[PDB]
Amino acid sequence: FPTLISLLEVIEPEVLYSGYDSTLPDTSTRLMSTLNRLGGRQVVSAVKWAKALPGFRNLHLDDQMTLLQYSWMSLMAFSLGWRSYKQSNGNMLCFAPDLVINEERMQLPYMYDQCQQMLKISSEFVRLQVSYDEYLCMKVLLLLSTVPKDGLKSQAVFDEIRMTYIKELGKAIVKREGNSSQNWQRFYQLTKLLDSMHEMVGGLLQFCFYTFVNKSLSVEFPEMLAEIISNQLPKFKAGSVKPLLFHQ
Amino acid sequence: SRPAILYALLSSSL
Ligand SMILES: C[C@@H]1C[C@H]2[C@@H]3CCC4=CC(=O)C=C[C@]4(C)[C@@]3(F)[C@@H](O)C[C@]2(C)[C@@]1(O)C(=O)CO
Ligand SMILES: C[As](C)(=O)[O-]
């Protein structure tokens, strides 16, 4: 019988390559389009990941659709943060091994602001010195951290899943340190981080909606993301979305 | 309406 943490490790998606062509010069439109094309594939990876996530398949199909639509950007941004922390200690954005945006590349028109946002996530990992197991658990929590304002078709199951993974984050913290009462200080810090993710991601979500809607910027989106964004867009304009916070 | 590919992936239904 395998532990839940070890399953989380085995099912974690492998880092994708972008297949960016470093031959041609960089432009804002091209870069953003490349990132979106990469995001499409990363999201498909995340869906396959969710389907293998212990617990997740028990939710109603419509709750599955809902949680993935509401949280895809969180998942992607969080992973980006992790990779950036791991490969460059938060100095560069490591989108893919073949696509790293450093200080210089950020100077492109439009890029600087959006990149500053994504780096915030990265430096959080740096500040708190997050561990792999902590990261894996927090990531699951993000999937389960945004619900519709009037709840889910199977709130029963949802609440149980959410509780299992909170417990799991617990074990992960303990495994780093032992059974001190600094353990609950850490739990606070990490739950504070999960909370601050709604604001940080909200920023990204805004840029995303903007570049999606405003055709004149000529940013392309793959069908996967386009379908999701266009469905998710009215729901966010109508503020019918509720974050689950750990704190006040 | 409802996002097609995401739906296809989650139901898996022929
Ligand atoms: C600032 C926003 C937030 C960006 C996303 C941040 C999270 C992410 C992680 C990746 O590893 C690759 C793609 C995505 C999923 C993303 F990088 C791109 O899709 C482009 C994106 C939406 C954005 O850059 C744009 O709206 C530009 O189109
Ligand atoms: C099957 As995979 C490692 O693209 O999630």
Q: What is the 3-state secondary structure (H, E, C) of chain B?
A: CCCHHHHHHHHCCC
Task: Identify residue A95 by its one-letter amino acid code.
Answer: F
> Which candidate from A44, A51, A231 shows the least CB-CB separation from B3?
A231
Q: Is the dihedral of CA A133, A34, A49, A232 positive or negative?
A: positive
Kindly list the domain boundaries of chain A, sorted by start residue.
Answer: 4-243
Quote the CA–CA distance of A153 and A3 in Å, as a whole number.
29
Nearest CA in chain B to A63: B10
Q: Is residue A45 helix, strand or coil?
A: helix
3-state secondary structure of A193: helix
In sequence order, what are the residues at sequence separation of 6 or more whose Cβ sits closer than 8 angstroms to the Cβ of residue A241?
A70, A146, A147, A148, A149, A235
- A35 alpha carbon – ligand 1 mean position (Å): 6
Gap between the Cα atoms of A23 and A111, Å rounded: 20
Instruction: Report the run of H or E that residue A99 belongs to, with start and end.
Output: strand A99-101
A219's CB contacts (< 8 A; 6+ apart) are: A29, A32, A33, A36, A211, A212
CB A142 less than 6 A from any atom of ligand 1: no
In A182-242, alpha helices (H)? 183-213, 223-237
Cβ pair A243, A198 in contact under 8 A: yes
Closest by Cα among A204, A215, A235 to A39: A204
Separation between Cα atoms, residue A190 and residue A137, nearest integer Å:
11
Contacts of A71 by beta carbon, 8 Å cutoff, 6+ apart? A142, A143, A144, A145, A146
Third-level CATH fold of A4-243: Retinoid X Receptor (1.10.565)
Phi, psi of A166 (to 5 degrees): -60, -45
Nearest ligand to the C-alpha atom of residue A79:
1
Method: X-ray
Angstrom resolution of this structure: 2.8
Q: Which residues pair with A101 in a beta bridge?
A: A93
